[PDB]
């Protein structure tokens, strides 16, 4: 039963979520696609930081824990936001609310099919659930507040915050989906798949190492092992 307090936390999550990028165009056209992709990732991270700051509970965590949680959930939130931009008709993803990218365009940007294919498989699967803005917002809050990330200190409070959002989600989905009692769990199970993708990603970041292809400073910081 959605309480008044949950009602208002969710609306703040939804409201919190509502440009110089090297454009999309041979070693020059190749390095530029990568640069376009990597600069979209940087826009997202910046976007994920300002969103987190608005998460009830987030800025009360110690700064270290804030950085511990955004470090590791940044990719999973990027995959969640990619998944909401998926066009099932052409099997592409519309970034910039403008230009559409497909598996092949992902590969031209430097990424490898071992990661591309799962990205699109996950996006396909998230599309079938047809989540709305609140459900995506709450899933992202839930991903960010994972007590088990490497190096989180106050594990207990991070977990307590995650359950509040988990319950808000439970309550909200009982109003949005009053006959399918599986929609709530089907949404949480997607966080399972995102851990796997976050792992496949680390292999992508390592493949970038071995072919000496430099991430820009902000993403090197969060994704490269120093």
């Amino acid at each position: 039963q959605l309480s008044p307090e949950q009602l208002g936390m969710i609306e703040k999550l939804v409201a919190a979520q509502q440009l110089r990028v090297t454009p999309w165009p041979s070693r020059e056209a190749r390095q530029q696609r990568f640069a376009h992709f990597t600069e979209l990732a940087i826009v997202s991270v910046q976007e994920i930081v300002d969103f987190a700051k608005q998460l009830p509970g987030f800025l009360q965590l110690s700064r270290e824990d804030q950085i511990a949680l955004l470090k590791t959930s940044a990719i999973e939130v990027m995959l969640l936001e990619t998944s909401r931009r998926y066009n099932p008709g052409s099997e592409s993803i519309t970034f910039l609310k403008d230009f559409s990218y497909n598996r092949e365009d992902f590969a031209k940007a430097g990424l490898q099919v071992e990661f591309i294919n799962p990205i699109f498989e996950f996006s396909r699967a998230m599309n079938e659930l047809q989540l709305n803005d609140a459900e995506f917002a709450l899933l992202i809050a839930i991903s960010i507040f994972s007590a088990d990330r490497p190096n989180v200190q106050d594990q207990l409070q991070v977990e307590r915050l995650q359950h509040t959002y988990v319950e808000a989600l439970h309550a909200y989905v009982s109003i949005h989906h009053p006959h399918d009692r599986l929609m709530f769990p089907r949404m949480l199970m997607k966080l399972v798949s995102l851990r796997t993708l976050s792992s496949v990603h680390s292999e992508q970041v390592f493949a970038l190492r071995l072919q000496d292809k430099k991430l820009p400073p902000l993403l090197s910081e969060i994704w490269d092992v120093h």
């Binding site: 804030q66 511990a68 470090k71 910081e221 969060i222």
Partner: peptide, 15 residues
């Protein structure tokens, strides 16, 4: 700490 290692992210969090 991670903070010492994550200057850009830390600054995004500060600003």
């Amino acid at each position: 700490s991670l903070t010492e290692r994550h200057k850009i992210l830390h600054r995004l969090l500060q600003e």
